[PDB]
Motif scaffolding. Sequence first.
Motif, PDB file in Angstrom:
ATOM      1  N   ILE B 293      47.107  31.846  48.627  1.00 26.03           N
ATOM      2  CA  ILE B 293      46.004  30.912  48.562  1.00 26.03           C
ATOM      3  C   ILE B 293      46.008  30.190  47.213  1.00 26.03           C
ATOM      4  N   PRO B 294      45.461  28.953  47.198  1.00 22.34           N
ATOM      5  CA  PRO B 294      45.383  28.173  45.983  1.00 22.34           C
ATOM      6  C   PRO B 294      44.231  28.602  45.096  1.00 22.34           C
ATOM      7  N   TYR B 295      44.447  28.438  43.798  1.00 18.21           N
ATOM      8  CA  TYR B 295      43.362  28.647  42.858  1.00 18.21           C
ATOM      9  C   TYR B 295      43.522  27.733  41.656  1.00 18.21           C
ATOM     10  N   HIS B 296      42.372  27.267  41.140  1.00 20.76           N
ATOM     11  CA  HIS B 296      42.300  26.388  39.989  1.00 20.76           C
ATOM     12  C   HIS B 296      41.634  27.097  38.820  1.00 20.76           C
ATOM     13  N   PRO B 297      42.406  27.794  37.980  1.00 21.35           N
ATOM     14  CA  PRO B 297      41.811  28.698  36.997  1.00 21.35           C
ATOM     15  C   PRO B 297      40.980  27.980  35.959  1.00 21.35           C
ATOM     16  N   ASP B 298      41.276  26.695  35.737  1.00 27.00           N
ATOM     17  CA  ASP B 298      40.619  25.924  34.694  1.00 27.00           C
ATOM     18  C   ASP B 298      39.804  24.797  35.318  1.00 27.00           C
ATOM     19  N   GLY B 299      39.405  24.972  36.571  1.00 31.18           N
ATOM     20  CA  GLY B 299      38.613  23.972  37.246  1.00 31.18           C
ATOM     21  C   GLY B 299      39.470  22.907  37.923  1.00 31.18           C
ATOM     22  N   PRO B 300      38.818  22.024  38.701  1.00 31.47           N
ATOM     23  CA  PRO B 300      39.512  21.147  39.650  1.00 31.47           C
ATOM     24  C   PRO B 300      40.315  20.043  38.969  1.00 31.47           C
ATOM     25  N   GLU B 301      40.076  19.855  37.666  1.00 29.33           N
ATOM     26  CA  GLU B 301      40.855  18.912  36.879  1.00 29.33           C
ATOM     27  C   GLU B 301      42.079  19.578  36.254  1.00 29.33           C
ATOM     28  N   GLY B 302      42.228  20.909  36.392  1.00 28.89           N
ATOM     29  CA  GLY B 302      43.370  21.607  35.829  1.00 28.89           C
ATOM     30  C   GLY B 302      44.460  21.890  36.868  1.00 28.89           C
ATOM     31  N   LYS B 303      45.426  22.715  36.475  1.00 28.10           N
ATOM     32  CA  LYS B 303      46.532  23.074  37.354  1.00 28.10           C
ATOM     33  C   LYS B 303      46.031  23.939  38.520  1.00 28.10           C
ATOM     34  N   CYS B 304      46.883  23.990  39.532  1.00 30.53           N
ATOM     35  CA  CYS B 304      46.692  24.812  40.704  1.00 30.53           C
ATOM     36  C   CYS B 304      47.787  25.856  40.746  1.00 30.53           C
ATOM     37  N   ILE B 305      47.369  27.147  40.803  1.00 27.86           N
ATOM     38  CA  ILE B 305      48.302  28.246  41.018  1.00 27.86           C
ATOM     39  C   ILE B 305      48.182  28.782  42.433  1.00 27.86           C
ATOM     40  N   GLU B 306      49.059  29.746  42.757  1.00 26.29           N
ATOM     41  CA  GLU B 306      49.003  30.467  44.006  1.00 26.29           C
ATOM     42  C   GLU B 306      48.717  31.954  43.727  1.00 26.29           C
ATOM     43  N   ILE B 307      47.734  32.515  44.442  1.00 24.15           N
ATOM     44  CA  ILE B 307      47.470  33.955  44.451  1.00 24.15           C
ATOM     45  C   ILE B 307      48.017  34.548  45.737  1.00 24.15           C
TER      46      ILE B 307
END
Lengths: 496, 495
Positions: B293-307
Amino acid sequence: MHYTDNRYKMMECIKDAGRPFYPHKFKISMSLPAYALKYGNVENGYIDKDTTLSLSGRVTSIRSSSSKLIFYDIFCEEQKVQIIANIMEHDISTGEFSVSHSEIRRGDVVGFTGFPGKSKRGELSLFSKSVVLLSPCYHMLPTAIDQEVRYRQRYLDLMLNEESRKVFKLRSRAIKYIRNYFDRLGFLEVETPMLNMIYGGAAARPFITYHNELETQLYMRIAPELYLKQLIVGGLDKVYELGKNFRNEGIDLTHNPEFTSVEFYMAYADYYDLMDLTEELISGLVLEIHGSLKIPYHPDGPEGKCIEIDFTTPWKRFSFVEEIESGLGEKLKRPLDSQENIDFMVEMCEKHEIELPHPRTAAKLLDKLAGHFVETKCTNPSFIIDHPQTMSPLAKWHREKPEMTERFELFVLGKELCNAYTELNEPLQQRKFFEQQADAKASGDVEACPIDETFCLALEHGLPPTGGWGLGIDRLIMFLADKNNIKEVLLFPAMR
Amino acid sequence: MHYTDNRYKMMECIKDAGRPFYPHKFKISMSLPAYALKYGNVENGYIDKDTTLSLSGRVTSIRSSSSKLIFYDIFCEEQKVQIIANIMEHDISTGEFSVSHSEIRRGDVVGFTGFPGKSKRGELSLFSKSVVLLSPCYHMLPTAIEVRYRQRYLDLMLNEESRKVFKLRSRAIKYIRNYFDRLGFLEVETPMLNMIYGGAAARPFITYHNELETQLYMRIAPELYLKQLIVGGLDKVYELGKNFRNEGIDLTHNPEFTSVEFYMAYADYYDLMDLTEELISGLVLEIHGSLKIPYHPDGPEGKCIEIDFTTPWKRFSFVEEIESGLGEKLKRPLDSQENIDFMVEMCEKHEIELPHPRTAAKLLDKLAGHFVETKCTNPSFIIDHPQTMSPLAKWHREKPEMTERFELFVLGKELCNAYTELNEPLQQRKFFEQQADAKASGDVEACPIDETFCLALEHGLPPTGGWGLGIDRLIMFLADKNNIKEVLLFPAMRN
Ligand SMILES: Cc1nc(N)c2c(F)c(F)c(NC3CCCC3)c(F)c2n1
Ligand SMILES: Cc1nc(N)c2c(F)c(F)c(NC3CCCC3)c(F)c2n1
Ligand SMILES: N[C@@H](CCCC[NH3+])C(=O)O
Ligand SMILES: N[C@@H](CCCC[NH3+])C(=O)O
């Protein structure tokens, strides 16, 4: 005293002798209910020596019938199973038979392994080869139920009393039924804060606490109403919330400092709609539990009389003011919040030996008169309707009746189950009523709430015509389960 | 500007003229979703003049295109419908057309009655004959989105994404209850008001019950009551509700939060890890259709990682992973003064902020937070915590000084805390004494002794596994939010 000390000594000895001391994991083959379902109808004397099974429960009985043979009863998950331990079947790798068994006492949590079947006399049994002491009991247990022990040590009550265990199963069934009712109607289940910078939404004294880092007092909520209505402003249309509310108040047979309520808010409903939903929901739940709408109740406890409560719908309506006036034989003075009416109501309290409220607000006086003249008529489920505005700061003015609101309360055997109304959605009046409440609070009314500007601002964004409602689920469970004391339907009730 | 004051004046005028003023009931014919389902694929220009319907919603748009024709959009229950108000259809018993429509503003809750169908251009419409002002908006509304949190109704009114979050939250909670219900657990409620607080490392709220003349604490956890129900024979219990902290607020901490705790007789922590994986991976799959699943650790203006929730999840052993980070071994025993001093030295060496007081437990926690929690991106178990930091966890069946405990971390944030429960009353009393001693030395997170609990253990707690999940934090991952304020309707806000 001696029993407890000695048991501690006996367990230290076990520990020091290298014997099993509080095993971490015992793997059961199946639950005792499952065991009973599987083997409960085998023939007398049946034994399956080809199947080895592990079981566990609390020891309720130990009988050594001979030097070779010990009978135990164990109980778990509402099922009793007999264990038959014969020295000839004992697994000597676990210890000598007498040593293994000498460690066990009535009340211990134990595990056994053996062959399944039924004794010659027809008792569901395990024919054991081993016994493991899992968790000893260090107290000599009463064999069956000051009776304050039931509440201050509820685990003893639960260990000994099937009736008490059934109440908490009924409680969950009722709560599940209620959530299911709203869920199926398309309500969204929400959670709103139990910690409020400004309390509101009920006639109640709150608990007060403090948040160090935010440097503010907080109150424990008396109701979720003011947050819920903001969700209807928000367009969610149908919301409910089922959980705890709090009262910094005295305790009695129907009042605890925390209780479970469900409140819902429904756009486009009025209080007539709410009465119909109340009837539908509660008659439904009564039928689900009892199989009809006429149910037994013991108002004075299980050794007292049994009455019948009739939930056949529709229920009686009593109009608040008219029923007081019928009781008095004359009319209240108008306006109802005038000094003339306050004085008349104080006079009537003296005449009729009604205990006065403090302070003597028109709302409080009205409430004491209703308590005496109207709530006393509410044996079977009955609505008391059309409450004066002066006592109903969040209820919308009545479309027909001057000075009244579109409000009801449900009473059963004189106890309040529900409170509901067509919601006030007009911000000018709402602010005026909040001012009146803050005035009352300042005059010493501990049940009056402060002004909540955040709510008034929410109303200024447009609350749709809405109906709202609350139910005291514990009190309903008292009727459903036939209990006359709140302490019977709460696991850990408040105690003086 | 004066818009609010003026609206109040408009409403007073309406009231004084005997015109509709906050009608009590408006009876809709059908919902807007039902209207759309019924008429949404009639032919362009279709109108049924034989059917009069009543509809209601919030006005999202007004276009007075001429003196004779006004177009509205209304919104209700996730559906928008166009209203076409033509002077030629207007019911004059409700007022002159210009008067009736002069009363309506964008944001108002309104009712309309009229004929169903579709405009020539193909818009689902009601051709109205009347309009009723049900509840005016006294504020000029933004056309689209701190205000979202302090005035959540505005966020909900304007922002579909916010409405989706709270629907997902309910779905998740329903999934959780269902998971335990189907396993035969009894749902219970235990007191939020405690004479003696316990069952977590936390500073509680304090209040007072006037009539009973007693100080009370708001619960930090249900654990000690729940375990009494297992002594009581209930076997499988769970409780999903609020717990409280008198602590700081940040992106993952609010002063009240929703957790579920369960207690299962006959389970150990190995069983609990297996259940954790099954419940959480199952819920992820339900919502996302994948375990990644996607996650934006620094909010929607930051990078997207995968968990990645694929099982089996990573296990890290608490002390071994600290020692791997240090490149040297902790001193033994772990609660000795020698090891406390050594852990202070290691904190200084590695620029780890020191706890206060410097107890063995607090120092171990700081070390784990620096060296171990930082490795936990995908769901990972940290296991086998030292006893000195684990007063309610049962000693490890193999490892000296350790317990049968785990915590679940996702992106370095604590989701679960669980253990094979301590059921041996002598040790339990000793650990409580040590906690009370910590408290007396200044540890604001250490709990006082609870005699009532120790006496319950003396009645025989079966071997048991217990567990807790921070539901809000899970929803942050499920809904992809990095701020707790996004997943609570009414989050705590600084003054
Ligand atoms: C066990 C218990 N304890 C209390 N203290 C209660 C209370 F104060 C109440 F106002 C109350 N009213 C109900 C009507 C609408 C909301 C709930 C209760 F159902 C209470 N139930
Ligand atoms: C939003 C929020 N706020 C808090 N303050 C939390 C907290 F203090 C916590 F200990 C906490 N631990 C979880 C692991 C087991 C019990 C729940 C949380 F999940 C919290 N979640
Ligand atoms: N908050 C009310 C119940 C709902 C009343 C209607 N909005 C009470 O606590 O009595
Ligand atoms: N009460 C723990 C969760 C349960 C741990 C196992 N008994 C907490 O607040 O962290």
